Design a protein around this ligand. Structure first.
Ligand SMILES: C[n+]1cn([C@@H]2O[C@H](COP(=O)(O)OP(=O)(O)OP(=O)(O)O)[C@@H](O)[C@H]2O)c2nc(N)[nH]c(=O)c21
Ligand code: NA
Length: 112
């Protein structure tokens, strides 16, 4: 179902010992469940996390969240970090679960 890729790849980097990781700002974009999606990502060299989710529509919201969770498993990206981004949302996503926008955990789910 999911189709997309990195419109802004994170930085690929080499760790001591030769391992290849990803860090810094990135953007993944594509279509999940008939919805255009942008996922803004950051990472510090030890983990990678969601900063914001941007959707073209909420018509398939909970299905899109499940597709985002599955993609984040493949990309090694968590939803445990409290993003500083706020505004333009009714809900945030935290641990891949929907929370009211009043909360501070996780990241906004912004319908554009
Ligand atoms: C570019 N990139 C690649 N990956 C990881 O590597 C998988 C393949 O990611 P990919 O489809 O972008 O292919 P590739 O990394 O080989 O890029 P190419 O060589 O130019 O064709 C992804 O499913 C992730 O596990 C990445 N994972 C993260 N977190 N961030 C990135 O920017 C990233
Ligand atoms: Na970290």
């Amino acid at each position: 179902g999911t189709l997309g890729g990195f419109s802004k790849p994170q930085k690929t980097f080499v760790r001591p010992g030769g391992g290849v990781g990803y860090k810094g700002k990135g953007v993944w974009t594509g279509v999940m469940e008939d919805t255009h999606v942008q996922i803004l990502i950051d990472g510090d060299g030890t983990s990678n996390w969601l900063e914001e989710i941007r959707l073209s529509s909420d018509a398939r919201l909970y299905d899109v969240i499940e597709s985002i969770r599955r993609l984040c498993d493949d990309l090694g990206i968590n939803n445990r970090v409290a993003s500083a981004y706020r505004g333009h949302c009714m809900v945030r996503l935290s641990g891949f679960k929907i929370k009211p926008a009043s909360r501070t955990d996780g990241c906004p789910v912004r319908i554009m």
